[PDB]
Amino acid sequence: IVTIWVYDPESASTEELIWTAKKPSLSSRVLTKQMNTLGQRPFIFTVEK
Amino acid sequence: VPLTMPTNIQWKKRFKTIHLGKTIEFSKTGLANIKNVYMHKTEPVGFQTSIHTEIIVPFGIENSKDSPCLLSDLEITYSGKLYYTIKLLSKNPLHELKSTDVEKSVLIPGYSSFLIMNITDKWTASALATMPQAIKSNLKFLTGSWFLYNFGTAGGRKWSISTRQCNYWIQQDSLDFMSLNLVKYIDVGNTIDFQFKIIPKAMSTFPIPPVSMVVGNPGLVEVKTQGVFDLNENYYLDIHVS
Amino acid sequence: SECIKRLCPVYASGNGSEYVLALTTGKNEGYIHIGTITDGLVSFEMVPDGWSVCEKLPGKNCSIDWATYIADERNLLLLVKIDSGQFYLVNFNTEFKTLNILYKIPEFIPEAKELDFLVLLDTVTYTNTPMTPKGLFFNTLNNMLYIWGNFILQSYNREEFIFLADFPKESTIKYMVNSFKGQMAVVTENEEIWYFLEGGYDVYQVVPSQGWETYHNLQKMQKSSFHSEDESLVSLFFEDGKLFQLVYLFDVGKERLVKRLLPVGTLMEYNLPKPFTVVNQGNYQAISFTHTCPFKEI
Amino acid sequence: HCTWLLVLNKFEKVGLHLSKDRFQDHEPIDTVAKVFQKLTDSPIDPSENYLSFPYYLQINFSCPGQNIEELARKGHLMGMKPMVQINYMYSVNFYRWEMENVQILMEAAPMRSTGYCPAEAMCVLNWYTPMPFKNGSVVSSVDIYTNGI
Amino acid sequence: LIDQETDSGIYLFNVQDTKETYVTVAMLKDGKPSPRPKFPSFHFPSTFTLPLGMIFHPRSHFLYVYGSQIWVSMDGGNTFEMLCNLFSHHVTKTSNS
Amino acid sequence: YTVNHAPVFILGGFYDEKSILFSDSNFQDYVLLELSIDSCWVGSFYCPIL
Amino acid sequence: YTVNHAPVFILGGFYDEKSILFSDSNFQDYVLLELSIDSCWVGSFYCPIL
Numbered sequence: 049i050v051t052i053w054v055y056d057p058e059s060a061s062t063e064e065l066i067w068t069a070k071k072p073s074l075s076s077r078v079l080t081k082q083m084n085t086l087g088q089r090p091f092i093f094t095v096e097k
Numbered sequence: 098v099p100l101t102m103p104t105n106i107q108w109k110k111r112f113k114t115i116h117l118g119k120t121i122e123f124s125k126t127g128l129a130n131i132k133n134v135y136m137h138k139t140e141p142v143g144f145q146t147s148i149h150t151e152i153i154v155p156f157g158i159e160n161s162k163d164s165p166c167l168l169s170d171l172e173i174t175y176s177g178k179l180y181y182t183i184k185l186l187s188k189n190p191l192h193e194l195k196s197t198d199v200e201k202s203v204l205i206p207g208y209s210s211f212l213i214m215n216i217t218d219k220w221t222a223s224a225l226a227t228m229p230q231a232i233k234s235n236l237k238f239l240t241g242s243w244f245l246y247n248f249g250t251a252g253g254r255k256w257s258i259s260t261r262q263c264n265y266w267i268q269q270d271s272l273d274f275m276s277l278n279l280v281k282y283i284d285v286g287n288t289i290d291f292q293f294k295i296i297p298k299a300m301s302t303f304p305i306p307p308v309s310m311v312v313g314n315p316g317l318v319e320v321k322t323q324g325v326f327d328l329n330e331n332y333y334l335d336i337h338v339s
Numbered sequence: 340s341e342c343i344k345r346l347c348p349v350y351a352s353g354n355g356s357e358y359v360l361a362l363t364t365g366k367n368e369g370y371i372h373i374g375t376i377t378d379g380l381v382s383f384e385m386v387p388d389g390w391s392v393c394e395k396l397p398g399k400n401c402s403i404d405w406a407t408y409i410a411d412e413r414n415l416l417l418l419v420k421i422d423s424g425q426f427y428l429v430n431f432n433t434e435f436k437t438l439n440i441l442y443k444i445p446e447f448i449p450e451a452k453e454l455d456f457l458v459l460l461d462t463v464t465y466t467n468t469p470m471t472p473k474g475l476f477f478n479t480l481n482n483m484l485y486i487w488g489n490f491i492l493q494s495y496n497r498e499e500f501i502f503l504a505d506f507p508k509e510s511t512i513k514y515m516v517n518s519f520k521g522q523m524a525v526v527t528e529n530e531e532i533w534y535f536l537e538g539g540y541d542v543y544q545v546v547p548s549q550g551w552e553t554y555h556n557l558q559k560m561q562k563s564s565f566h567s568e569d570e571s572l573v574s575l576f577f578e579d580g581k582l583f584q585l586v587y588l589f590d591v592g593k594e595r596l597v598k599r600l601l602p603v604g605t606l607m608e609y610n611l612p613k614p615f616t617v618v619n620q621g622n623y624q625a626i627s628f629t630h631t632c633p634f635k636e637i
Numbered sequence: 638h639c640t641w642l643l644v645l646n647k648f649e650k651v652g653l654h655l656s657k658d659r660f661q662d663h664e665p666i667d668t669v670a671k672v673f674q675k676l677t678d679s680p681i682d683p684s685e686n687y688l689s690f691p692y693y694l695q696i697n698f699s700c701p702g703q704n705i706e707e708l709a710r711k712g713h714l715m716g717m718k719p720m721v722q723i724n725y726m727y728s729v730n731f732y733r734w735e736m737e738n739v740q741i742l743m744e745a746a747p748m749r750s751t752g753y754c755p756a757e758a759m760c761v762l763n764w765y766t767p768m769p770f771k772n773g774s775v776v777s778s779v780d781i782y783t784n785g786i
Numbered sequence: 787l788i789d790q791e792t793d794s795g796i797y798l799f800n801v802q803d804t805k806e807t808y809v810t811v812a813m814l815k816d817g818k819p820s821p822r823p824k825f826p827s828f829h830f831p832s833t834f835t836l837p838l839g840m841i842f843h844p845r846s847h848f849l850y851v852y853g854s855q856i857w858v859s860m861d862g863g864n865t866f867e868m869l870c871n872l873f874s875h876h877v878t879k880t881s882n883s
Numbered sequence: 884y885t886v887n888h889a890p891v892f893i894l895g896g897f898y899d900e901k902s903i904l905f906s907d908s909n910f911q912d913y914v915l916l917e918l919s920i921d922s923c924w925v926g927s928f929y930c931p932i933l
Numbered sequence: 934y935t936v937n938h939a940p941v942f943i944l945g946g947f948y949d950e951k952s953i954l955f956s957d958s959n960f961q962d963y964v965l966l967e968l969s970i971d972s973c974w975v976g977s978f979y980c981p982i983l
C-alpha cells in the first residue's frame with residue numbers, strides 16, 4: 049500500500065527533502081487539495097508488463 | 098515639411114495616393130510595405146504627411162563611429178514656445194554633436210520621435226517632436242536605449258519608393274478554364290459553376306476576402322458565391338451562375 | 340418592511356426563476372431579504388430565519404456589506420462586517436439552515452515584491468496599508484469566487500485564496516464586469532480599467548497606456564466621429580466577448596453619446612514597452628527585437 | 638470605413654417613413670389572403686391560410702466621403718445583397734417552455750422608396766427584410782453580412 | 787458612349803465658362819436615347835479643370851474618365867472614384883489590352 | 884441585468900434627476916426617460932436615510 | 934369635521950413634522966401621533982409643488 053502526495057521542492061519540509069516524512073506538511077497538503085480541486089490524479093504503471 | 102516655405106510648392110514635400118501599395122527600401126538595409134496614406138495638415142507642427150507601413154526587413158540603424166554622441170545619456174525637455182531641448186549629460190570632449198548630425202531622427206522604442214534641425218551648443222540641440230501630445234514631462238535616457246536614423250536628403254537621399262513583387266497566385270484545377278479569356282453559354286435552366294484557389298505569397302488579409310467580384314448586368318443573371326478559408330490562408334471560392 | 344439599504348444582483352438564471360437581494364440598514368441588521376420571481380410571479384422573503392447572524396460569530400452586531408446567491412446547491416455567500424471592523428465571509432445553505440464562517444479576511448495588506456501569485460498562507464508578513472472590501476463576484480461556469488475592493492482574491496475551492504501582486508493598494512475598485520468566457524474587466528474609482536484573463540494571473544493595465552495613446556491618435560487621423568478629445572465614460576460592459584463602452588462627448592456640435600468597441604487585443608498589441616535587441620546584419624546594425632511568445636502559430 | 642445600419646419600420650409605411658419605429662405590437666395580423674389569392678400559376682395550396690407578422694427591417698450601408706443613397710445605388714447596381722441571419726435565445730423558463738434554439742436565414746429585398754423622384758428609374762433606395770418572431774422567447778440576435786459580391 | 791451590357795448611353799457634359807463637369811446616363815428607346823436619366827447625374831468636383839474623354843475597358847464594364855484628372859467607375863457609371871490627379875497636366879492617349 | 888436574457892436595459896445614477904436611460908439593443912439608441920415615480924422619503928426612528 | 938357626527942378629531946399644521954393631534958372627545962386627552970405615511974413629493978412639468 050502506497051501513500052502519495054505532491055510537494056514543491058522550494059517550499060517543502062526538511063524531512064520530505066531527505067525522504068523521512070510520513071505526513072505531508074501544510075504547503076504540501078494545500079497544494080495537493082488544490083490539485084484534486086483543479087483535477088490532478090496520479091496513477092502507477094508497471095514497466096516490464 | 099519645413100516651416101516658412103511657400104504654399105504653391107508645398108506639394109513637393111507631401112505624400113500622395115501614388116504611394117498606396119508601393120514599398121519603401123533603405124540603402125543600408127530594410128524593406129517595408131506601404132499600407133496607408135494619412136493626411137493631417139494641422140495637428141502636428143512641421144509634419145503634415147504620414148504613411149502606415151509594415152516591416153519585413155527590420156531596417157538599419159546608425160553607427161557610433163560617424164555619430165559619436167551615441168555614447169552618452171540623453172535628456173529631453175520642453176523648450177520655450179514649441180521646440181524641444183536635447184541635452185547630452187556626458188561632457189566628454191570626444192562625443193560632442195557634429196554639425197553633420199542635422200536632419201537626423203532620434204528614436205526610443207516606446208516614446209515619441211524627435212528630428213534634429215539645430216545644434217545650439219556642443220552638447221545642446223533643438224528638436225521637433227512627432228506626436229508631442231504624450232510626453233507631459235521631462236525624459237531621461239541612457240547610452241544604449243536610443244538610436245539614430247538618417248533618412249534626410251543631406252549627403253544624398255538614401256531611401257526609395259518602388260513597386261512590389263507579385264504576391265497572389267491563382268490556381269484553377271478544372272480543365273478548359275485556364276484561359277485568361279472565357280466565354281460560356283447558358284440556356285434556360287442549366288447552371289454553370291467554377292472553383293478557384295487563391296494562394297498568398299506574403300502577409301494576407303485573413304478577415305477580408307481578397308477577391309471582390311463585380312457584375313456588369315445583374316438583371317439577367319443570378320450569381321451565388323461561397324468563399325472559405327484554409328489553414329494556411331489559402332482561399333477556396335466557388336461561384337454558381339444561372 | 341422598509342429601511343432597505345442596498346440592492347444586490349444575481350446574474351444567474353436557474354430553477355425557472357430570477358433572484359435579487361435586498362440589504363437593509365437601520366433595523367434587522369442581522370437580516371437580509373431574498374426576492375425570487377418565477378416567470379413574472381414575484382415574491383420576497385427574509386431568509387436568515389429567527390436567529391440573527393450575530394449568534395454564531397464574535398462581536399455584537401452584524402452588517403451585511405455584500406451578498407450573493409447560487410441557485411445550484413441553494414447557497415448564499417455573504418460578507419459581514421462586525422463591530423470591530425473585521426470582515427468575515429460566511430456561507431449559508433438554504434436547504435439546511437447552516438451558516439459557516441469560511442474566511443476571516445485578513446487586514447494590513449501584505450507585500451509581494453516578486454510573488455506575482457501568492458497563496459495566502461498563515462506565515463505571511465503584513466504591511467501598514469489596510470484592506471477594504473466593497474463586494475464579491477461569482478463566476479459559476481468554473482465555480483469560482485472573486486473578492487474585490489482594494490485587492491483581488493480568487494479560489495476554485497473554499498479553503499485558501501490567492502493574492503495578486505500586480506494590482507496596487509492605492510487604487511480602489513469601482514466595479515468588475517465579466518465575459519462569462521474568461522475575461523475580467525475591473526474598473527476603479529480612478530476611472531481606470533484593468534483587464535485580466537482567467538488562464539493567467541497577471542492583471543494588465545489598459546486605458547492610461549502606450550497602446551491606448553497609439554490607438555487614440557490612430558483614430559484621430561482616421562478622422563472618424565466616434566473619438567473625441569473630451570469624453571465621459573458613462574458606462575462599459577461586455578457582449579459576445581467584446582468590450583463595449585458607452586461614452587458621451589462634449590465636442591462642440593457633437594455633444595453626443597455613443598457606444599464603441601474597446602479592442603484589447605489591439606490595445607496591448609500596441610504596447611511598445613518590450614525587450615529590444617540589436618544585431619549586425621550586412622555590416623549594418625538592425626533592431627531585430629526579441630520574440631517573447633513561446634511559439635509561432637496555433 | 639463601411640458599416641451597416643438597421644432601423645425597424647412600421648409595415649404600413651414601407652417607403653414614406655424612414656425614421657425610427659419602435660417595437661410595440663406583438664400580434665401578427667391576417668392581411669395577406671387578398672394578395673396570396675392573386676397568384677394563378679404558382680405551386681401554392683389554396684386550402685391553407687397565411688398571416689403576416691408586423692414590422693419590417695430596413696437596411697442600408699454607409700461609407701464616409703459619399704452619401705448613403707449613392708452607396709446603396711452602387712451596391713444594387715453591383716449586386717449587393719444583405720444576408721441576414723437571426724438566432725433566438727430561449728427564455729429563462731424550462732417548465733412551461735423548452736430551451737430550443739432556432740435560427741432563420743434570409744436575403745433582403747430592394748425597395749424604391751416612394752416619393753416625387755425626379756429621376757426616371759434609380760432613385761432613393763433601401764433594402765427591406767421581413768421580421769419574424771416566435772412564441773416563447775424575447776432575445777433575438779440579428780446578424781447582417783454581405784452576399785459576397 | 788453606348789453600353790450594351792445595360793443598354794444605356796453615357797454623356798460626359800461640361801458647361802463652358804464654368805468648372806462644372808458631370809456624367810449623365812440615358813436610356814435607349816428603340817435605339818434612340820431619351821431624357822429623364824436612370825439615376826441622378828454624377829457631378830465632378832470643381833478641381834477638374836479640363837476633361838478629355840472616357841474609355842471603356844474592352845470586353846468589360848470598367849469606365850475611365852481621363853483629362854486633367856483620372857476617375858474610374860465600375861457599374862453603369864453612377865459613382866466615380868479618384869485614382870490620380872495631374873495638376874496643369876493632361877493625359878493625351880491611352881493604350882490598353 | 885441577466886447574463887444574456889435581458890430584453891431591455893436600464894441605467895440611471897445621475898446628479899439629482901430621477902431619469903434613466905432605458906433603451907433596447909445595447910444602447911445603440913439611447914432614448915432618455917423621466918420616471919413617473921413620485922419622489923418619496925421614509926420617516927424616522929426605525930428609519931433614517933437622510 | 935362634520936357638524937356633529939365625527940367620532941374622532943384630527944389636527945396638524947405643525948412647523949415641519951408629519952405629526953397630528955388625533956384624539957377622541959373634544960381634545961380632553963391630546964394623544965399625539967406620528968403618521969405612518971412617508972414623505973412624497975411629485976415631480977415636474979404637469980406638476981410643480983416645490
Ligand SMILES: *[C@@H]1O[C@H](CO)[C@@H](O[C@@H]2O[C@H](CO)[C@@H](O[C@@H]3O[C@H](CO)[C@@H](O)[C@H](O)[C@@H]3O)[C@H](O)[C@H]2NC(C)=O)[C@H](O)[C@H]1NC(C)=O
Pocket residue numbers: 642643644654655656657695696697705706761762763
Ligand atoms: C438609411 O437608413 C436609415 C435608417 O432608418 C435612414 O436614416 C433615418 O432617416 C430619417 C429621415 O426620414 C431620420 O428621421 C430624422 O429624425 C430626426 C429626429 O427625429 C429629425 O430631426 C429629422 O428631420 C428626420 O426626420 C432617422 O432618424 C434616420 N435614422 C437614424 C437612426 O438616425 C436613412 O434615411 C436611410 N437612407 C436614405 C437615403 O433614405
Ligand SMILES: *[C@@H]1O[C@H](CO)[C@@H](O[C@@H]2O[C@H](CO)[C@@H](O[C@@H]3O[C@H](CO)[C@@H](O)[C@H](O)[C@@H]3O)[C@H](O)[C@H]2NC(C)=O)[C@H](O)[C@H]1NC(C)=O
Pocket residue numbers: 663664665686687688770771772
Ligand atoms: C403563441 O402561440 C400561439 C399558439 O400556437 C399562437 O397563436 C396561434 O397562431 C395561429 C397562427 O398564427 C392561429 O391560427 C390562425 O387562426 C385563425 C383563426 O382561427 C385562422 O383564420 C388562421 O387561418 C390561422 O389558422 C391560432 O388561432 C393562434 N391561436 C391563438 C389561441 O391565438 C401565437 O401566434 C404565438 N405567438 C406569436 C407571437 O406568434
Ligand SMILES: *[C@@H]1O[C@H](CO)[C@@H](O)[C@H](O)[C@H]1NC(C)=O
Pocket residue numbers: 214215216217
Ligand atoms: C537655428 O535654425 C535657423 C534656421 O535654420 C538658423 O538660421 C539658426 O542659425 C539656427 N541657430 C542655431 C543656434 O543653430
Ligand SMILES: *[C@@H]1O[C@H](CO)[C@@H](O)[C@H](O)[C@H]1NC(C)=O
Pocket residue numbers: 368399400401402420421422
Ligand atoms: C449595531 O450595528 C451597527 C452597524 O454595524 C454598529 O455600527 C453598532 O456599533 C452596533 N451596536 C453596538 C452597540 O455596537
